[PDB]
Design a protein around this ligand. Structure first.
Ligand SMILES: Nc1nc2c(ncn2[C@@H]2O[C@H](COP(=O)(O)OP(=O)(O)OP(=O)(O)O)[C@@H](O)[C@H]2O)c(=O)[nH]1
Ligand SMILES: Nc1nc2c(ncn2[C@@H]2O[C@H](COP(=O)(O)OP(=O)(O)OP(=O)(O)O)[C@@H](O)[C@H]2O)c(=O)[nH]1
Ligand SMILES: Nc1nc2c(ncn2[C@@H]2O[C@H](COP(=O)(O)OP(=O)(O)O)[C@@H](O)[C@H]2O)c(=O)[nH]1
Ligand SMILES: Nc1nc2c(ncn2[C@@H]2O[C@H](COP(=O)(O)OP(=O)(O)O)[C@@H](O)[C@H]2O)c(=O)[nH]1
Lengths: 411, 50, 419, 426
């Protein structure tokens, strides 16, 4: 029962710096699914990788696993897909092969990337393509960072996001959306950190990842493996983009006063004020939900809570799915990180659902992409890197098809 | 003007919500009526079998 | 002499079966080490029916259930060769658990059960505990039922199967599994004792008045039912009724073999010493409609037949006036063209801890409600082909779901017809 | 054989029955754990009338506590002999009615009566030959009066062939606790005249009088008042439980005391009841028992029967007594005060003897007198009811709930024709 994790780009490996800190702390036979770690950091700029090489975990990671290129992708999908990716991607997958060879019961791969950059978009898509050819049947869990509407650090990130999602449809099997502006709002509202950095974000992303893989590492009352999300949450082959949420994201002061139980945290996991994507699920209709439970939880109240949700009317369900839930209970309580801003909890819930609010995000991104592209702004950089004028319009029409698919299924 | 358009739209949405709540009451009690009334049908059914 | 072989499939089946062997081994006085320490010599005489190593075969597709079996007590008593066990895992996919992963585990489970079957002299039947919602439990267990009937056609077969309910709904593909599982059960199993978690949670709320009914107690209730149904083989009685005699008394037509079950007595810890143990009192708890372990209220229809297996030193005269009174009082709830619709049986050995127990098996016509209750959800999802590609890309086609629909549709039609 | 089930409604009903089951279980020699520890076999042969053997010497009382507030039931179970009731019989709501006869008869009644009826049905079919039912409640409150009265109505539609007792306290002007007492008393009595078999009227005013003069208690809390009421109630149904020289069962006593079908409100007394100061200075003979019985100042209602005429009267004696002395003493007190007795019925008193006195006493008595002075109470209450309804005080808390003005006109009309017909037979 083993799963290997690859981390791409400056955002992917910084997220990994939080993920592996949590894993080793959590395991101090159950460790076999992760443990040397089963990871490869890979990036085109050596500055962030050598932060790992000179850090505290110098001995934990095998030296070759840390892959580092020689020059950056310059925030160009084209550069990170056709020019520089072509040299690093072959070395990356030649390592993933013999790591999978050491494994026996490999559940799947899970990838971490941000689609706004060059490496995370470009060679992230390239790596996923060649993995689909080599394995195909094995699940690939894609935790992407789409760019937010109003909070932005780049300018051409619409180009990269559209050009990355076009391949993200037919390559990853499970795809989880995580914006940055939404998590900023979460850390401001519930965790009351008025000045958050990337470190806090990456810390609670690791908490989500660990909660959905804890069913493999530890025995629960009702276990749910990596193939279950594949089946219970994806009604159609082209709809796989999932909202994520976690509860309780509570500061130390508030948590002790609050009485944490299953019914209220099951409620808290469904309000739009506690999701990892800035979108309005009230604007959409739910297709199917999945509830991960950790800690002291009996099957009664998780069933009682789900009954109260289905009877409430501020959130509506789709007509083609009357039984729209997939619950899961595990015994092990969530662990904490010294210095982390979350307090210890008896029980936590991670929700991974699917709706049509995501269909609203893609139209909102398409407009910004559409505006710049018509007068060919910024196109000449990518074309010089090896691309042409054709693939921008054809990627545009692919997103148009996706918009129509969401409007039709929700009917 | 927009600050007041918002108030009229909010009023309209609440007028629908209190309506939705009342509709659930109608749904619930009517289900109860079916249970009591079908019991009445079984009693008359039992009467004729005897 | 008369032999019963045990087969446990899936996560649900394994934990039910784990609790089952705990209770039976306790009754036969065998320690968790595997040695006899009992008191009475009546128990040694009929311990070959189940044994001292149990005659069971655990089967699933994930190591967690096997590890959790050997961890707990009475986990060192199974023969490690009977832990026939795959490695990959179907995971709530009936097509995977019935065509893809079954196709390579089924040959090995069949070899161990064939060795365990021919090891004895005269089989009474097999006893399968599984679910109808999961994939590796339902689908694989279902295929095992079909394979066994081809090799052993004259032997009995029990299936303790739980069904999904919309009030207690675990996964999203529940109706896709329940409909297909029934399509195979209606032609393969000899009889099935339908269970579900909604009625079980309801029992533990009202009658047991438990605060936190974890899966241990639910599996404990189902285990008490399975111990009660085969007491007639394992212990002498004033009127014996083995498995075969219950089947022929309960099934009037060859497709009517889905039973609802109850158990008596069930009382809270608080009211445990405030109560009496008499045959009339147990009968009022038997025929109560809130004591069935299915989500199908039998008072919304008629009974076809019913049976009550009693354990303890009883007077057979009391049995007869209670059964005739319940038939003459509520004459509309029973079918008219069969007189004296009640079969009874007595065994002299009560379960450990009680003085007088009873087990109810009712073949009613209220079962067509739950099957229609299922076909509704299945009908809507199938119409727009939701979740269908995860099954179709494995070998299943559309006519298979239509065929299961027709079998679901004509079963409830003949229940209505005989109603 | 003959069987009586017990029903306690509301807060007042719960405490009355609690002291009752303590006293009776004491009489049968059962310890608060519920096991038999008696000495003779006179006690064992007739414990099927009230209790049921559970398992290995466990006897459970056949009672059903029914109310709407958690605290009231909890108090009975905290105290001794609380651990003997079967927990299923604790039929119990959660919201509350609160002195609203409409809420107790239309709002919260409609969702609790079915459940308590299921317990009553199970408790009724658990025995073979019903003798009757026993209900204790009040007429001023809402969760006892309105809910309990609807319970009475449901029973009459279910079992119209069986007997029915109701021990009901009535609100008085001098002892008036709540403010909606008249709007509750009038409608409750209205439902009582059409459903109850016979009603034994009690009231808190007479209870205070007895505890000052005769008992001479210093701090008479409700435990001691209920002690009086429980001893009296046990005196009525002693004849079903114990053998005597002259047995008088409940239905036998009802047909002897009720000359007309609507005339079934009884006044009660009990003897002997003395202070511990004068206990040593008197004896135990039939004259001392009869004079303290027929004393108007010793009646357990605040309606002086000497302001009217006795229609019929009954006396149930307990202890080893001679029936010759019984009727001669009864005849003497009927001949002297001949004006207080009705004229066209000779020997207006039915009498019976039982041979087992209560524990600690050699001789007791219980008086049940169907008088005509009860019309004063209905006038004394009806005028307060009419005074409020003329200008609609407090009306909207009932009107806004489902009753109309015609229901009040109906209630006043039935009280008015009842007082008129009592005055006629006077
Ligand atoms: N959650 C999170 N997001 C990050 C972090 N660092 C960068 N990002 C996001 O990454 C996106 C920008 O693209 P980058 O990840 O920096 O690009 P890259 O992977 O470094 O690829 P190149 O920069 O071209 O080498 C924006 O959405 C940033 O918000 C981080 O530490 N945590
Ligand atoms: N001589 C004598 N007469 C008695 C005795 N006991 C009762 N009686 C008479 O019986 C008469 C009433 O009839 P009972 O026998 O008591 O009652 P019953 O005839 O069984 O009729 P029910 O009361 O309906 O059962 C009274 O007038 C008494 O005089 C007794 O011990 N000796
Ligand atoms: N009574 C009972 N039911 C269970 C237990 N474990 C799981 N279930 C039920 O089984 C269903 C899921 O079946 P599952 O175990 O996933 O089947 P499998 O995946 O094929 O092995 C859920 O609806 C649960 O209600 C148990 O210990 N006792
Ligand atoms: N004798 C007696 N009377 C009581 C007791 N408790 C309450 N009462 C009387 O009950 C009247 C109020 O009725 P209430 O308890 O509110 O009735 P309920 O709320 O409908 O159950 C008051 O006038 C009290 O005098 C008691 O323990 N003994």
């Amino acid at each position: 029962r083993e799963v290997i994790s690859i981390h791409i780009g400056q955002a992917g490996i910084q997220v990994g710096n939080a993920c592996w800190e949590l894993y080793c702390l959590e395991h101090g036979d159950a460790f076999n699914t992760f443990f040397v770690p089963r990871c490869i950091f890979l990036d085109l700029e050596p500055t962030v990788v050598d932060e790992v090489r000179t850090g505290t975990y110098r001995q934990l990671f095998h030296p070759e696993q840390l892959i580092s290129g020689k020059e950056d992708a310059a925030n160009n999908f084209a550069r990170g897909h056709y020019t520089i990716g072509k040299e690093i991607v072959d070395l990356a997958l030649d390592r993933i092969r013999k790591l999978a060879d050491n494994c026996t019961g490999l559940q799947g791969f899970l990838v971490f990337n941000a689609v706004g950059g060059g490496t995370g978009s470009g060679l992230g898509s390239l790596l996923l393509e060649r993995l689909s050819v080599d394995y195909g049947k094995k699940s690939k869990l894609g935790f992407t960072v789409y760019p937010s509407p109003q909070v932005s650090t780049a300018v051409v990130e619409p180009y990269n996001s559209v050009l990355s999602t076009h391949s993200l449809l037919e390559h990853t099997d499970v795809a989880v959306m995580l914006d940055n502006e939404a998590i900023y709002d979460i850390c401001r509202r519930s965790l009351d950190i008025e000045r958050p950095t990337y470190t806090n974000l990456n810390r609670l992303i690791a908490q989500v990842i660990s909660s959905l893989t804890a069913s493999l590492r530890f025995d629960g009352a009702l276990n749910v493996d990596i193939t279950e999300f594949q089946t219970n949450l994806v009604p159609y082959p082209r709809i796989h983009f999932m909202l994520s949420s976690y509860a309780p994201i509570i500061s130390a002061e508030k948590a002790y006063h609050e009485q944490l139980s299953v019914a209220e945290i099951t409620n808290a996991a469904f309000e739009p004020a506690s999701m990892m994507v800035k979108c309005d699920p009230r604007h959409g209709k739910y297709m199917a939900c999945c509830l991960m439970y950790r800690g002291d939880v009996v099957p009664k109240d998780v069933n009682a809570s789900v009954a109260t949700i289905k009877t409430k009317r501020t959130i509506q369900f789709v007509d083609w799915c009357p039984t729209g839930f997939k619950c899961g209970i595990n015994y092990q309580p969530p662990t904490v990180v010294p210095g982390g801003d979350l307090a210890k909890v008896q029980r936590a819930v991670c929700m991974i659902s699917n709706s049509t609010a995501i269909g609203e995000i893609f139209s909102r991104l398409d407009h910004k992409f559409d505006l710049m592209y018509a007068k060919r702004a910024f196109v000449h950089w990518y074309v010089g890197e090896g691309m042409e004028e054709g693939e921008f319009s054809e990627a545009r029409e692919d997103l148009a098809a996706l918009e129509k698919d969401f409007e039709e299924v929700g009917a | 003007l927009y600050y007041l358009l918002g108030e009229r739209t909010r009023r309209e949405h609440l007028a629908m919500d209190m309506k939705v709540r009342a509709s659930q009451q109608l749904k619930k009690d009517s289900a109860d009526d079916l249970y009591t009334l079908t019991a009445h049908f079984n009693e008359m059914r039992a009467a004729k079998e005897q | 002499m008369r032999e019963i072989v045990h087969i446990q499939g899936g996560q649900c089946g394994n934990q039910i079966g784990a609790k089952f062997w705990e209770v039976v081994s306790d009754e036969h006085g065998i320690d968790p080490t595997g040695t006899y320490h009992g008191d009475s010599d009546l128990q040694l005489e009929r311990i070959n029916v189940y044994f001292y190593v149990p005659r069971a075969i655990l089967m699933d597709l994930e190591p967690g259930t096997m590890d959790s079996v050997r961890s707990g007590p009475y986990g060192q008593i199974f023969r490690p060769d009977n832990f026939v066990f795959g490695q990959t895992g179907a995971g709530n996919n009936w097509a995977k658990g019935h065509y893809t992963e079954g196709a390579e585990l089924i040959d090995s489970v069949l070899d161990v059960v064939r060795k365990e079957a021919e090891s004895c002299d005269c089989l009474q039947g097999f006893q399968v505990c599984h679910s109808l919602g999961g994939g590796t439990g339902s689908g694989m267990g279902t295929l095992l039922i079909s394979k066994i009937r081809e090799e052993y056609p004259d032997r009995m077969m029990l299936t303790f199967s739980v069904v999904p309910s919309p009030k207690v709904s675990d996964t999203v593909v529940e109706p896709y599994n329940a409909t297909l599982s029934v399509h195979q059960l209606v032609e393969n199993a000899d009889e099935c004792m339908v269970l579900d978690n909604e009625a079980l949670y309801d029992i533990c709320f009202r009658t047991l008045k438990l605060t936190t009914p974890t899966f241990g107690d639910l599996n404990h209730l189902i285990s008490a039912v399975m111990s009660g149904i085969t007491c007639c083989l394992r212990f002498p009685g004033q009127l014996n009724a083995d498995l075969r005699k219950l089947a022929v008394n309960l099934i009037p037509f060859p497709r009517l073999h889905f039973f609802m079950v109850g158990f008596t007595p069930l009382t809270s810890r608080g009211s445990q010493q405030y109560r009496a143990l008499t045959v009339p009192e147990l009968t009022q708890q038997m025929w109560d409609a809130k004591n069935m372990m299915c989500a199908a209220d039998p008072r919304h229809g008629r009974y076809l037949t019913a049976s009550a297996l009693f354990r303890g030193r009883m007077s057979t005269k009391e049995v007869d006036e209670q059964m005739l009174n319940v038939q003459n009082k509520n004459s509309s709830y029973f079918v008219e063209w069969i007189p004296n619709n009640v079969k009874s049986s007595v065994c002299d050995i009560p379960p450990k801890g009680l003085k007088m127990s009873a087990t109810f098996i009712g073949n009613s016509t209220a079962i067509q409600e739950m099957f229609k209750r299922v076909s509704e959800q299945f009908t809507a999802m199938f119409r727009r082909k939701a979740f269908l590609h995860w099954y179709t890309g494995e070998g299943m086609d559309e006519m298979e779901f239509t065929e299961a629909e027709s079998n679901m549709n004509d079963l409830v039609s003949e229940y209505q017809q005989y109603q």
